[PDB]
Symmetry: C5
Subunit: 357 residues, 5 copies
């Protein structure tokens, strides 16, 4: 019979939690994972009591200024930090007989900051707008805004850069340039220092005013950030469920999930609220929703089994000290490789740079 024919649409196989990923689906199946990340900026979630910690959860604890030009030691519960998660996806392959192997590949992302209309709470005990009578409206969140999000297959590579290289960050509880380099910061740390490099592996530990997304040579992460400074800049946010970001690069690949993990990073700063006291500011952050679309991709084997065959050659032998054949005090003078045959050249050690003339 001449039936009506509804339009063809992707067929849902299964819908649920993270356990749904154990169903073996096939090579051309598409997964849509939905997650969120909370603003971990200052006060942790660990004291749940609305009285014990006052529940500045979602806020910082209060910005204390420096006592002198040389004396700057803020606090850890005052610095907003990077939120991150890692989604552990199921292992895909058993194919170590041909050097192809399939992993997960982030294709699209639908992301959104949640809670913007809550910034319309203009009652409450914040500094009023009419201050000479202490009436009017509770001043809403304003100031500097910082919105970065990243989606990759490895942790976000970071780059250290600070306003003052003499700030005394605590040596415990927070990851600082000194935590990585193991020595106090230099003047090259207020500009780009190629040495101040870390990875976003901890969550709520790397402050966003030290660590910024690193534009490394080759990368497996797509990050999108934007900054708005000032003291009373109005917050501006736009939400909708209608637009996606494409995560594919020029080769049309997009983040390959190595290991099997998918890393999400974010920081959403809306500004600060100033209290009804000495003008104590508290940073506000809002959560970010993620919707990552993953497909399966055939790649060339990223597991070198020669690594295992040579770790077997190496763990049979002791570890040796010796004289340096690596680094800046290398005692290796020269390495040259020959592959084919050529006509005998003239000058064979000939400079190919004109400035060497």
């Amino acid at each position: 019979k001449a039936c009506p024919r509804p339009a063809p649409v992707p067929k849902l196989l299964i819908k649920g939690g993270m356990e749904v990923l154990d169903l073996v689906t096939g090579p051309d199946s598409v997964t849509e994972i939905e997650a969120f990340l909370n603003p971990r900026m200052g006060q942790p979630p660990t004291p749940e009591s609305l009285t014990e910690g006052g529940q500045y959860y979602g806020w910082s604890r209060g910005i204390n200024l420096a006592t002198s030009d040389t004396e700057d030691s803020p606090e850890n519960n005052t610095l907003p930090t990077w939120s991150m998660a890692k989604l552990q996806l199921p292992m895909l392959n058993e194919d170590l007989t041909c050097d192809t192997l399939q992993m997960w590949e982030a294709v699209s992302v639908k992301t959104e900051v949640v809670g913007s209309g809550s910034l319309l709470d203009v009652h409450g005990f914040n500094k009023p707008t009419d201050t000479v009578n202490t009436k009017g409206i509770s001043t809403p969140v304003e100031g500097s805004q910082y919105h970065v999000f990243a989606v990759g297959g490895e942790p976000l590579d970071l780059q250290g850069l600070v306003t003052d290289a003499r700030t005394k960050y605590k040596e415990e509880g927070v990851v600082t340039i000194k935590t990585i380099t193991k020595k106090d910061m230099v003047n090259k740390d207020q500009v780009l220092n190629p040495i101040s490099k870390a990875k976003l592996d901890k969550d709520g530990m790397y402050p966003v005013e030290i660590w910024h997304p690193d534009p490394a040579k080759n990368e497996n992460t797509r990050y999108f950030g934007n900054y708005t400074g000032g003291t009373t800049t109005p917050p501006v946010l736009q939400f909708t469920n209608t637009l996606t970001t494409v995560l594919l690069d020029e080769n049309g690949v997009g983040p390959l999930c190595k290991g099997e993990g998918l890393y999400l990073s974010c920081v959403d700063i809306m500004g600060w609220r100033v209290t009804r006291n000495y003008d104590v500011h508290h940073w506000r952050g809002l959560p970010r929703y993620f919707k990552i679309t993953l497909r399966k991709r055939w790649v060339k084997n990223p597991y070198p089994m020669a690594s295992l065959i040579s770790s077997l050659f190496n763990n049979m032998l002791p570890q040796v000290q010796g004289q340096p054949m690596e680094g800046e005090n290398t005692q290796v003078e020269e390495v040259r490789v020959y592959d084919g045959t050529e006509p005998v050249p003239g000058d064979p050690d000939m400079t190919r740079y004109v400035d060497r003339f």
Copy 2:
């Protein structure tokens, strides 16, 4: 033949009200419904009197600040809320032999916030611009703005999120997170609690500072919002009758009307006006106009007919208590089965 031919345009079959939807038109017919939603924010429309209400209709009543860091009671007639409507559409065809149904499907929307030029009213008893001599102009509406609107085939899903979670919202007349989750707010309700969820179903009841459009796993609603903060930010609004918004998704479907209803939701905050007194800060909201274009779509029934019949009967009949016929104190004695 001899004389010219005008260009072809869509043929209008009928024009009128929601009554004209009862005309059976066919499978390829397109419907356009004009409608508007009013700014339900603060003062309700019930006291129509311009003296006993002062007529803050269209405005909020007046924002009272918290008395301490722990005491904060915000007076429901102060909080702007979500406006919503539901348009009941006619039942459609079906084809039981192929198991296909017909349902309505929103295809595009023309929306607009009406009344922007009314904010050029600079006479009146607002805080003057030259306040030392009380001269100048009456300060216009300024401040934080919030413009969200949604068009779906079912009520908009909401996600609870607040500033201080110690706020004492009134336990009647408003929908709080405590109304939904019968416990008090926790500290996780200041960031994102998957437990703090709701549906924008009543109207003028869900405060816009508690309830935000929730990005659920799978969705049947297209919402578009934007927020502008501050205390003196100039309102900006652009109106035209010339641009449309496509409600179709990646597969090209757009909001299918569950049951048979088409749900419209909006909130359009413009800022505050300040009075010539203690600086109370009434909100202003403007109405939103909707023009939804709908068509009929052939969809596939995803459920067995026996399951739908069982559900119909389970919802038809009242849940009775009764004497125990299952369990350990059963009153059924024997059950026998014969065949032949």
Copy 3:
């Protein structure tokens, strides 16, 4: 053989509205250019620069209310809608083949003129350094409102006011009370489907009351934008290259009913604050229009009997008369005869079509 030129469109005649009379052809294009002046408060009529001080192009002042309940806005302080109507020539007076022909606006080049005029920072306005009354004469600033419309009929408006307790003067201005002969209600502060109007007059409908109304089906394209605030730098961009297409979803654009082309406009730039009590004056700028029209073949939607009855109903006066309709009607019986039948035995039998056929009605005897 020497080089030939390129096919530029051929100009038949240029001039004024005189040029629209000459019969041009079926597929000719007309470009009409016009302008609308800012009619906001002070009218053009006292042309002397000393009597009205010539706030022409400006408003007259701003008078704050005296209490919550008593606000009187003083008509010369309210900016209003500018409008015009271009009377185009009749097209099909000759005849028609059950399809007429009307003018159709396809495009519009528009522009607000005089923005560099706002660089006059000399003059007697509130100085920048207000302690020593030196510096710069504060330029025009504040709330801006730019709307324009191009249609084939007057712009429909929707009433909406900041306050419904405002006492607009009952003469010289059109308000919600003028159109709905009652007072304003609280619903007139949100959206009343009842407070509607047409942009009929010019310099009469204030823009703080009357907004372009999104009706169901429309013959007008309007584009507007509003920028609030008190200081709010003015921003304006003028160019002789951008065009607006007036064709709609179906590719038609505004069909000129009758043969009129209606332009509406309001371009508010902000206020000038005087060196006095801080009296504010609205500033507006003229708007230039360039509308491109063509002739469209259009089918008549209405039947001839309807048009003839409309003609006669608008010619003849409307009658009060005695009640031949209603519950106290004075009509006694109405009989209709169509064919012929044998003589019925009852002369006053009743006959009526219930649903399909006429049924004779006995009187209730048995």
Copy 4:
């Protein structure tokens, strides 16, 4: 056997100054002219010495405010004006045989306001930021901005519009509306007066607060402007060397250079400088660089349409004032019309008219 092939690229024929245009290059050649206009807005370039004129060159002299609502004399050296230049291109057609001429034709323009980084000079003698202790930063250039530029084959047509129509401008040194109308300004000059119209043909002469690019009937100029008002608005500028503007219109022509002249007009106002005194404001303007790409276009010869056939159809009407040939004091004695041929009648002074429908010979005397 083979050897590589670079990619095709337009071949440069010659490169130099304006004399390079003397080489005859054929019909399909393309010319690119770089040029700049300086801000001639305020103090003139003439006194070169850095003490005599203080060297407010590039700047304006101090803005002086009005003394009362009726006395306003704005002191020519404080009034930014339009920059304009004309480039005389070589004359193309040397053959009068057939009906085709050749014109220059501006196709594209790369333009740029250069010097924006100079506005970061915050050392200097300006109103400080912390003016209490007179310390901080010398306040940078801020305020209201105005950037216009035009490229055409004719001088830019201007329209007059003023903030105040009293505004006693000096009568020599600038071209005001009175300089053109010969009468005092009227109130219609604060709105669009179709009479206050000029052409930008002198440089440093037409103030930007009086004269604005006129959207006229038919045009041979592409102008792009934008305005930002206010008193402390931050200046914004975006310079690059990658984007070009297309000057072709809807028919794809672009400004045809008549008389072989190319006209560049510009005004780039950046805001004000405030002095460490009474808050005396000085306008800052920056130069504008142009790169116009020109080609040759075959146009039709217009001269065969001589002036006697192309008679005074345009606004070539000087006026009518003469002895009365109309009205009741008319001096026309008699008019008669003849069309055909008839047999010789009797009375040669017979009068003959045509009634409401047809012809009738008036009865004879008697």
Copy 5:
């Protein structure tokens, strides 16, 4: 034999430092160089101690205003300058048979200003937001902003322009207009002088408030700048690793690296930091990262190598200073060129000439 095939992507031969470029690869090979430039914004990097300089590195030292209208003399460590770098690439092939050689060609650039989130340091010793009690937030960096970056095959052409032509810029440590034109600045230099032009060969030497990218008739560099002014304007910065700038032009070429070098120029000013003592207004600048993608392109040699090597060998011959056979005091009295044969003409003193296309016998001299 039947395993699935991954998709083809560009094959990386090798990666490392600038030494990796010494491997001869082939005509269709593509290189991508990642680099960065630090802000040369007043104070230099060299006094690296955090107390000897206070380390205003990345900042300027402090803006000292003019004492009078006529004398304005700024310190060199208070003027932000252009950052630049040259990247010397290897030599490529040549082909004297058809006089073509291949050059390096910049095709794309991914650029980014790094460190925007460092401007969220609102603790610290700056002018507080509530000044009557010296509490609140230490005011963040704000003010006038200036972001330019350029990528080319030759050094960036500059064009001088100043607010005041009467400023006393120090004669050493900074390249001003007076350094290039040995005279003082004139009033033409406040507007536009086609005379005050320079290149960007040095680094930390050309101040940004004097030297602006010049839109010359010609150019081999692509530059992108934008300026935002004011006193309290908030900084705005957008960063991502996903946006690319196409450096090709109308003909689709893009910057050709003459002299094998590739030139990066930048200045990224974010505003001022105001100190607590007075309103001292140090500038702030952030580093810019560049990822430039280069390819090899065959180009025609513009100048024939014959004339070049001829002039090279002629400069080996002794140069002599004899009696003038050149110029206006020439002792050359006659030069005649005969080529063919013709019937014996009339006037034996005839003059023949060539007028911009072809030979014309000079007009019959009895005019």
